[PDB]
Amino acid sequence: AQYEDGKQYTTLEKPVAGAPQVLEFFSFFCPHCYQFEEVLHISDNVKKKLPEGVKMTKYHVNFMGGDLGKDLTQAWAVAMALGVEDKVTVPLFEGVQKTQTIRSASDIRDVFINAGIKGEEYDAAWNSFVVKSLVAQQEKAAADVQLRGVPAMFVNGKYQLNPQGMDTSNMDVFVQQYADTVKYLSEK
Numbered sequence: 001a002q003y004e005d006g007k008q009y010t011t012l013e014k015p016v017a018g019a020p021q022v023l024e025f026f027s028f029f030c031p032h033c034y035q036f037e038e039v040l041h042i043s044d045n046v047k048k049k050l051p052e053g054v055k056m057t058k059y060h061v062n063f064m065g066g067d068l069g070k071d072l073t074q075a076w077a078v079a080m081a082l083g084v085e086d087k088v089t090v091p092l093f094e095g096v097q098k099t100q101t102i103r104s105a106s107d108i109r110d111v112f113i114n115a116g117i118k119g120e121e122y123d124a125a126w127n128s129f130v131v132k133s134l135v136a137q138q139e140k141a142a143a144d145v146q147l148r149g150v151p152a153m154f155v156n157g158k159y160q161l162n163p164q165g166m167d168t169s170n171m172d173v174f175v176q177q178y179a180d181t182v183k184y185l186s187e188k
Contacts (some may be wrong), residue, residue, distance in 0.1 A: 007162065007165040008162055008165050008166055009155075009165075010162050011159055012145065012157070013052075015157055016144045016158075018023070019144065019145075019156065020055065020057035020157075021056075021057075022046065022050065022056045022057060022155055023057045023058075023059065023153065024043060024055060024056065024059070024151065024152070024153045025060075025142060025145075025147055025151065025152045026058065026059075026060060026151050027063075027064045027069065027072070028065075028076075028092050028096045028102075029065040029067065029068075029069055029096060029097075030150050031097065032150070032151055036151045037089065038090065039171075040174070042066050042151070043056065043058065044142055044176060045153070045175050045176070045179040047183045049179050049180065050181070050182070051187060052187055058085070059076070059141055060077075060138060061150055064129055068104070068105075071108055072096070072134055073135055073138060074103045075088075075092070075105075075109075075112070076124065077134035078112070078125040078131055078162075078178055079129045080134055081125050081131055082117065082121065084115065086111070088111055088112060088115055089159075091111045091114070091115065095108075095111055097183050105168065109122055135164055145157075145160070156185070156186070156188075158188075159185045159188070163178060166178060166181070172184065
């Protein structure tokens, strides 16, 4: 058929209960993740095709970048808690990978300060238990899908996107196929 298990997507042997409808994992340290977000705009293209009443969720992962990697997961939790994901995603990616001016937790915070988040507000979120559970949620989700690598995307806790089974020639054909596959999986 057009969409085939083993081709554009795979099926989790152990479906995840209560999972987000569309769940993306990434790291600000991950070069392919930089490409996915800043050059290919995968999230944005996926969302433009999602059905009514389907929400896209994006989680950070710890396993790249050691101590700073975990700081970034915690800062991403802060971003989710404050609802400022769309103001810090680009400068966090560029700060870690393009300028490489992000080398410590303080450098991460500067990005938020520069983007208009009050210091008090960042610090209160950073130290909050709400942010601690959000960090735990992200880690738990990784465990639940038995995450092995990033970038990755899972739909209804049942299906895993398989970009290696799509075409890689035209970046745009690739992106369109990826987004089209998420939409197909969403209605499955």
